Amino acid sequence: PKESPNPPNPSGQCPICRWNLKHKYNYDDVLLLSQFIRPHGGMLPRKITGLCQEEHRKIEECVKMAHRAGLLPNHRPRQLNRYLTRWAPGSVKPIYKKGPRWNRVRMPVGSPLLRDNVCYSRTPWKLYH
C-alpha cells in the first residue's frame, strides 16, 4: 500500500501536514495512529515514517495513551478502565499529601504535548485535575 492519490496539499515534508492535521488529532483517533506503529505496539522509526520531530513525539504519546486505554487490542507482543493516562500505570506514587489550596498537588491528565489542539470551548481544557 502507498499514499492515497488525493493529497489535500502536496509539497509537504510531514505526512501529518500533507493532509492538514498538524493541530487536529487526538489520542482516540485510532485510525490515524494505527498506521505509524509496528505490528507489536511499537512506533516506527522517524527516518521511515517521515514525520517531523514535533509530530513524531505527539504520535508517540498518542499511541502510548491509546494502548493504555485498550484501543489497540490486536497489537500485543505475542481490571481497571483508564483513559488519557500520561504516566505508565506502575510508576506513580499515591498523593498522600495533597497540599493546601495554594500549593495543591494535582493529578496529571492527558499529555501536554497536545497543548495546541483546536479548542472548542471557551475554558481551555485542563492538563492537570
Binding site: G12, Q13, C14, C17, K22, C52, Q53, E54, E55
Partner: peptide, 30 residues
C-alpha cells in the same frame, strides 16, 4: 524575591509580552 501588591501583579500579567505568530510552522515548511 518579595511578593508584589496585587494590582501590580495584574498590571504585570496584562502587559506580558505576546510574540508574533510565525506565518507557517518551520517543521512542515522551510
Amino acid at each position: 524575591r518579595r511578593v508584589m501588591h496585587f494590582q501590580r501583579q495584574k498590571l504585570m500579567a496584562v502587559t506580558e509580552y505576546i510574540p508574533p505568530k510565525p506565518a507557517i510552522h518551520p517543521s512542515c515548511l522551510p
